[PDB]
Design a protein around this ligand. Structure first.
Ligand SMILES: O[C@@H]1[C@@H](O)[C@H](O[C@@H]2CO[C@@H](O[C@@H]3CO[C@@H](O)[C@H](O)[C@H]3O)[C@H](O)[C@H]2O)OC[C@H]1O
Ligand SMILES: O[C@@H]1[C@@H](O)[C@H](O[C@@H]2CO[C@H](O)[C@H](O)[C@H]2O)OC[C@H]1O
Ligand SMILES: *[C@@H]1O[C@H](CO)[C@@H](O)[C@H](O)[C@H]1NC(C)=O
Ligand SMILES: O[C@@H]1[C@@H](O)[C@H](O)OC[C@H]1O
Ligand SMILES: [Cu+2]
Length: 235
Protein backbone atom coordinates (compact mmCIF):
# COMPACT_ATOMS: atom_id res chain seq x y z
CA UNK A 1 0.00 0.00 0.00
CA UNK A 2 1.73 3.13 -1.26
CA UNK A 3 1.02 6.33 -3.27
CA UNK A 4 2.96 9.17 -4.93
CA UNK A 5 3.16 12.46 -3.03
CA UNK A 6 4.84 14.47 -5.73
CA UNK A 7 7.96 14.78 -7.93
CA UNK A 8 11.35 16.51 -7.84
CA UNK A 9 13.06 17.90 -10.93
CA UNK A 10 16.90 18.10 -10.82
CA UNK A 11 16.68 17.77 -7.05
CA UNK A 12 14.13 20.51 -6.54
CA UNK A 13 10.79 19.58 -4.91
CA UNK A 14 7.84 20.52 -7.19
CA UNK A 15 5.46 20.49 -4.20
CA UNK A 16 2.41 18.37 -3.28
CA UNK A 17 1.16 16.93 -6.54
CA UNK A 18 -1.80 14.89 -5.31
CA UNK A 19 -4.82 15.62 -7.53
CA UNK A 20 -2.83 18.48 -9.03
CA UNK A 21 -0.22 17.01 -11.37
CA UNK A 22 -0.59 13.38 -10.21
CA UNK A 23 -3.81 11.52 -11.26
CA UNK A 24 -4.14 10.37 -7.70
CA UNK A 25 -6.48 7.56 -6.71
CA UNK A 26 -8.49 7.93 -3.48
CA UNK A 27 -6.35 5.64 -1.44
CA UNK A 28 -3.31 3.37 -1.46
CA UNK A 29 -5.15 0.11 -2.37
CA UNK A 30 -3.53 -1.96 -5.04
CA UNK A 31 -4.79 -2.68 -8.52
CA UNK A 32 -4.88 -6.48 -9.14
CA UNK A 33 -7.10 -7.09 -12.17
CA UNK A 34 -4.76 -7.28 -15.18
CA UNK A 35 -7.59 -6.63 -17.63
CA UNK A 36 -9.14 -3.63 -15.92
CA UNK A 37 -8.87 -0.08 -17.16
CA UNK A 38 -7.49 0.65 -13.69
CA UNK A 39 -4.20 -0.77 -14.98
CA UNK A 40 -3.63 2.38 -17.11
CA UNK A 41 -3.32 5.05 -14.36
CA UNK A 42 -5.14 3.57 -11.36
CA UNK A 43 -8.81 3.94 -10.36
CA UNK A 44 -9.30 7.73 -10.95
CA UNK A 45 -7.77 8.41 -14.37
CA UNK A 46 -8.79 11.95 -15.40
CA UNK A 47 -6.96 15.06 -16.48
CA UNK A 48 -5.71 17.01 -13.44
CA UNK A 49 -5.09 20.75 -13.64
CA UNK A 50 -1.27 21.06 -13.83
CA UNK A 51 1.65 19.51 -15.64
CA UNK A 52 5.28 19.67 -14.36
CA UNK A 53 7.66 21.39 -16.76
CA UNK A 54 10.97 19.64 -17.51
CA UNK A 55 13.57 19.56 -20.26
CA UNK A 56 15.14 16.52 -21.93
CA UNK A 57 18.09 15.35 -19.76
CA UNK A 58 16.47 16.46 -16.49
CA UNK A 59 16.31 14.09 -13.50
CA UNK A 60 12.61 13.37 -12.64
CA UNK A 61 12.17 11.80 -9.18
CA UNK A 62 8.94 10.25 -7.99
CA UNK A 63 8.32 10.30 -4.27
CA UNK A 64 6.15 7.55 -2.72
CA UNK A 65 4.66 7.35 0.79
CA UNK A 66 2.40 4.99 2.77
CA UNK A 67 0.13 7.09 5.06
CA UNK A 68 2.07 10.37 5.46
CA UNK A 69 4.99 11.92 3.61
CA UNK A 70 8.41 10.35 4.24
CA UNK A 71 7.13 7.57 6.46
CA UNK A 72 7.85 3.80 6.15
CA UNK A 73 6.94 4.18 2.41
CA UNK A 74 5.56 0.66 1.81
CA UNK A 75 5.40 -2.50 3.95
CA UNK A 76 8.66 -4.41 3.86
CA UNK A 77 6.81 -7.58 2.97
CA UNK A 78 5.95 -6.09 -0.42
CA UNK A 79 9.09 -7.27 -2.30
CA UNK A 80 9.12 -6.72 -5.98
CA UNK A 81 10.24 -4.74 -9.06
CA UNK A 82 9.80 -1.07 -10.08
CA UNK A 83 9.30 0.26 -13.63
CA UNK A 84 8.59 3.62 -15.25
CA UNK A 85 6.78 4.09 -18.56
CA UNK A 86 6.06 7.18 -20.74
CA UNK A 87 3.20 7.84 -23.20
CA UNK A 88 2.02 10.93 -25.09
CA UNK A 89 -0.67 12.76 -23.13
CA UNK A 90 -2.92 12.96 -26.19
CA UNK A 91 -3.32 9.11 -26.00
CA UNK A 92 -4.80 9.35 -22.49
CA UNK A 93 -2.82 6.14 -21.95
CA UNK A 94 -4.99 4.21 -24.48
CA UNK A 95 -3.57 2.04 -27.21
CA UNK A 96 -0.10 0.71 -27.80
CA UNK A 97 1.59 3.73 -26.32
CA UNK A 98 3.53 2.95 -23.14
CA UNK A 99 7.30 2.91 -23.53
CA UNK A 100 9.49 1.56 -20.77
CA UNK A 101 12.19 3.94 -19.50
CA UNK A 102 13.30 2.08 -16.38
CA UNK A 103 13.27 -1.42 -14.77
CA UNK A 104 14.81 -2.60 -11.53
CA UNK A 105 13.94 -5.99 -10.03
CA UNK A 106 16.51 -7.79 -7.82
CA UNK A 107 20.09 -6.58 -7.20
CA UNK A 108 22.23 -9.77 -6.71
CA UNK A 109 25.09 -7.78 -5.19
CA UNK A 110 23.16 -6.26 -2.25
CA UNK A 111 20.61 -9.06 -2.17
CA UNK A 112 17.75 -6.53 -2.35
CA UNK A 113 14.60 -6.10 -4.38
CA UNK A 114 13.76 -2.66 -5.84
CA UNK A 115 11.09 -2.14 -3.23
CA UNK A 116 13.55 -2.77 -0.44
CA UNK A 117 15.89 -0.06 -1.80
CA UNK A 118 12.93 2.25 -2.33
CA UNK A 119 12.26 2.17 1.35
CA UNK A 120 15.90 3.05 2.07
CA UNK A 121 15.61 5.87 -0.48
CA UNK A 122 12.74 7.45 1.44
CA UNK A 123 10.32 6.70 -1.38
CA UNK A 124 12.44 8.20 -4.12
CA UNK A 125 13.28 6.85 -7.53
CA UNK A 126 14.30 8.68 -10.70
CA UNK A 127 14.43 8.58 -14.45
CA UNK A 128 16.29 10.88 -16.87
CA UNK A 129 13.87 12.63 -19.18
CA UNK A 130 14.45 11.26 -22.72
CA UNK A 131 15.11 13.29 -25.84
CA UNK A 132 11.66 13.02 -27.27
CA UNK A 133 9.52 15.63 -28.90
CA UNK A 134 8.59 18.61 -26.83
CA UNK A 135 4.97 18.27 -25.61
CA UNK A 136 2.77 16.82 -22.93
CA UNK A 137 3.42 13.34 -21.59
CA UNK A 138 2.22 10.92 -18.94
CA UNK A 139 4.85 9.21 -16.81
CA UNK A 140 3.54 5.99 -15.26
CA UNK A 141 5.44 4.71 -12.25
CA UNK A 142 4.62 1.08 -11.29
CA UNK A 143 5.58 -0.88 -8.25
CA UNK A 144 4.71 -4.64 -8.35
CA UNK A 145 4.42 -6.25 -4.93
CA UNK A 146 4.93 -10.01 -5.19
CA UNK A 147 4.09 -11.26 -1.62
CA UNK A 148 0.92 -12.96 -2.95
CA UNK A 149 1.97 -13.45 -6.53
CA UNK A 150 2.25 -17.25 -6.26
CA UNK A 151 -1.48 -17.10 -7.11
CA UNK A 152 -3.26 -15.39 -10.02
CA UNK A 153 -5.92 -12.81 -9.25
CA UNK A 154 -7.97 -14.16 -12.12
CA UNK A 155 -8.15 -17.53 -10.26
CA UNK A 156 -8.17 -16.25 -6.66
CA UNK A 157 -9.10 -12.63 -6.14
CA UNK A 158 -7.91 -12.68 -2.57
CA UNK A 159 -4.35 -13.05 -3.83
CA UNK A 160 -2.28 -12.09 -6.87
CA UNK A 161 0.45 -9.66 -7.81
CA UNK A 162 -0.40 -6.12 -6.56
CA UNK A 163 0.17 -3.07 -8.77
CA UNK A 164 0.71 0.38 -7.27
CA UNK A 165 0.39 2.64 -10.33
CA UNK A 166 0.75 6.39 -10.50
CA UNK A 167 0.57 8.71 -13.51
CA UNK A 168 2.25 12.14 -13.47
CA UNK A 169 1.51 14.85 -16.05
CA UNK A 170 4.84 16.11 -17.38
CA UNK A 171 5.48 18.74 -20.02
CA UNK A 172 8.74 18.50 -21.92
CA UNK A 173 9.66 22.03 -22.99
CA UNK A 174 13.11 21.81 -24.51
CA UNK A 175 14.47 18.81 -26.30
CA UNK A 176 16.49 18.13 -29.40
CA UNK A 177 14.22 15.16 -30.24
CA UNK A 178 17.18 13.04 -31.00
CA UNK A 179 15.27 9.85 -30.00
CA UNK A 180 11.66 10.15 -31.23
CA UNK A 181 9.28 8.14 -28.98
CA UNK A 182 8.32 4.81 -30.57
CA UNK A 183 5.04 3.00 -30.09
CA UNK A 184 4.79 0.97 -26.92
CA UNK A 185 2.52 -1.47 -25.10
CA UNK A 186 -1.08 -1.22 -23.85
CA UNK A 187 -2.15 -1.07 -20.21
CA UNK A 188 -4.27 -2.99 -19.67
CA UNK A 189 -3.03 -5.63 -22.10
CA UNK A 190 0.70 -5.91 -21.77
CA UNK A 191 0.54 -8.10 -18.69
CA UNK A 192 -1.40 -11.35 -18.77
CA UNK A 193 -1.54 -14.42 -16.57
CA UNK A 194 1.26 -16.10 -18.48
CA UNK A 195 3.58 -13.08 -18.69
CA UNK A 196 6.90 -13.69 -16.97
CA UNK A 197 7.20 -11.99 -13.60
CA UNK A 198 3.43 -11.83 -12.88
CA UNK A 199 3.14 -15.26 -11.19
CA UNK A 200 6.13 -16.00 -9.05
CA UNK A 201 6.91 -17.44 -5.64
CA UNK A 202 9.30 -15.26 -3.77
CA UNK A 203 9.54 -17.54 -0.68
CA UNK A 204 10.79 -20.70 -2.41
CA UNK A 205 12.25 -19.51 -5.76
CA UNK A 206 15.59 -17.71 -5.62
CA UNK A 207 15.17 -14.02 -6.49
CA UNK A 208 18.06 -14.49 -8.96
CA UNK A 209 15.67 -16.46 -11.18
CA UNK A 210 13.07 -13.63 -11.27
CA UNK A 211 12.47 -12.12 -14.66
CA UNK A 212 10.49 -8.83 -14.67
CA UNK A 213 7.60 -8.52 -17.03
CA UNK A 214 8.37 -7.32 -20.55
CA UNK A 215 8.58 -5.08 -22.44
CA UNK A 216 12.29 -4.50 -22.21
CA UNK A 217 13.65 -0.96 -21.54
CA UNK A 218 13.64 1.20 -24.70
CA UNK A 219 17.11 1.76 -26.21
CA UNK A 220 16.46 5.59 -26.14
CA UNK A 221 16.12 5.56 -22.33
CA UNK A 222 18.83 7.36 -20.36
CA UNK A 223 18.62 5.39 -17.12
CA UNK A 224 17.56 6.18 -13.62
CA UNK A 225 18.08 4.98 -10.05
CA UNK A 226 16.40 4.19 -6.78
CA UNK A 227 18.03 6.71 -4.46
CA UNK A 228 17.16 9.73 -2.38
CA UNK A 229 17.69 13.08 -4.19
CA UNK A 230 16.19 15.35 -1.63
CA UNK A 231 15.27 15.62 2.01
CA UNK A 232 11.53 15.92 2.49
CA UNK A 233 11.96 16.93 6.16
CA UNK A 234 13.65 20.18 5.02
CA UNK A 235 11.65 21.26 1.95
O1 LIG B 1 6.94 -18.82 5.68
C1 LIG B 1 6.54 -18.39 4.37
C2 LIG B 1 5.21 -17.62 4.47
O2 LIG B 1 5.39 -16.38 5.17
C3 LIG B 1 4.65 -17.35 3.08
O3 LIG B 1 3.43 -16.54 3.50
C4 LIG B 1 3.06 -15.26 2.97
C5 LIG B 1 3.38 -14.16 3.99
O4 LIG B 1 2.92 -12.88 3.50
C6 LIG B 1 1.50 -12.87 3.32
O5 LIG B 1 0.97 -11.59 2.93
C7 LIG B 1 0.63 -10.62 3.96
C8 LIG B 1 -0.78 -10.08 3.72
O6 LIG B 1 -1.07 -9.04 4.67
C9 LIG B 1 -0.17 -7.91 4.51
O7 LIG B 1 -0.58 -6.84 5.37
C10 LIG B 1 1.25 -8.35 4.85
O8 LIG B 1 2.16 -7.24 4.69
C11 LIG B 1 1.67 -9.49 3.96
O9 LIG B 1 2.93 -9.99 4.39
C12 LIG B 1 1.10 -13.86 2.23
O10 LIG B 1 -0.34 -13.84 2.04
C13 LIG B 1 1.57 -15.27 2.60
O11 LIG B 1 1.38 -16.17 1.51
O12 LIG B 1 4.47 -18.58 2.39
C14 LIG B 1 5.72 -19.24 2.14
C15 LIG B 1 6.39 -19.62 3.46
O13 LIG B 1 7.67 -20.21 3.20
O1 LIG C 1 10.62 27.09 -9.68
C1 LIG C 1 10.01 25.88 -9.21
C2 LIG C 1 8.55 25.91 -9.61
O2 LIG C 1 8.52 25.95 -11.04
C3 LIG C 1 7.79 24.71 -9.06
O3 LIG C 1 6.40 24.78 -9.50
C4 LIG C 1 5.91 23.42 -9.69
C5 LIG C 1 6.05 22.96 -11.15
O4 LIG C 1 5.35 21.76 -11.46
C6 LIG C 1 3.91 21.82 -11.18
O5 LIG C 1 3.25 22.74 -12.07
C7 LIG C 1 3.64 22.27 -9.72
O6 LIG C 1 2.21 22.45 -9.63
C8 LIG C 1 4.44 23.54 -9.30
O7 LIG C 1 4.37 23.84 -7.89
O8 LIG C 1 7.93 24.66 -7.63
C9 LIG C 1 9.31 24.56 -7.21
C10 LIG C 1 10.10 25.78 -7.69
O9 LIG C 1 11.48 25.75 -7.29
C1 LIG D 1 -11.43 -7.51 -14.33
O1 LIG D 1 -11.79 -6.30 -14.98
C2 LIG D 1 -12.46 -6.61 -16.19
C3 LIG D 1 -12.60 -5.39 -17.09
O2 LIG D 1 -13.24 -4.32 -16.40
C4 LIG D 1 -13.81 -7.14 -15.67
O3 LIG D 1 -14.65 -7.43 -16.74
C5 LIG D 1 -13.66 -8.43 -14.85
O4 LIG D 1 -14.92 -8.63 -14.22
C6 LIG D 1 -12.65 -8.20 -13.74
N1 LIG D 1 -12.35 -9.39 -12.93
C7 LIG D 1 -12.56 -9.41 -11.60
C8 LIG D 1 -12.23 -10.68 -10.90
O5 LIG D 1 -13.00 -8.47 -10.92
O1 LIG E 1 -5.70 -0.91 4.06
C1 LIG E 1 -4.59 -0.56 4.89
C2 LIG E 1 -4.21 0.91 4.63
O2 LIG E 1 -5.22 1.79 5.15
C3 LIG E 1 -2.87 1.27 5.25
O3 LIG E 1 -2.53 2.63 4.85
O4 LIG E 1 -1.85 0.33 4.82
C4 LIG E 1 -2.11 -1.00 5.25
C5 LIG E 1 -3.41 -1.51 4.60
O5 LIG E 1 -3.71 -2.86 5.09
CU1 LIG F 1 0.07 -3.18 0.59
Amino acid sequence: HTLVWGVWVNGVDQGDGRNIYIRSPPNNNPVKNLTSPDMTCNVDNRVVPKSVPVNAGDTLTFEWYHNTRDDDIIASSHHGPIAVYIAPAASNGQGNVWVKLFEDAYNVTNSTWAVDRLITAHGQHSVVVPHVAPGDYLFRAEIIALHEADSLYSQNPIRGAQFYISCAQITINSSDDSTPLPAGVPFPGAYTDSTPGIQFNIYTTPATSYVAPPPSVWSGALGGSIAQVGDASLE
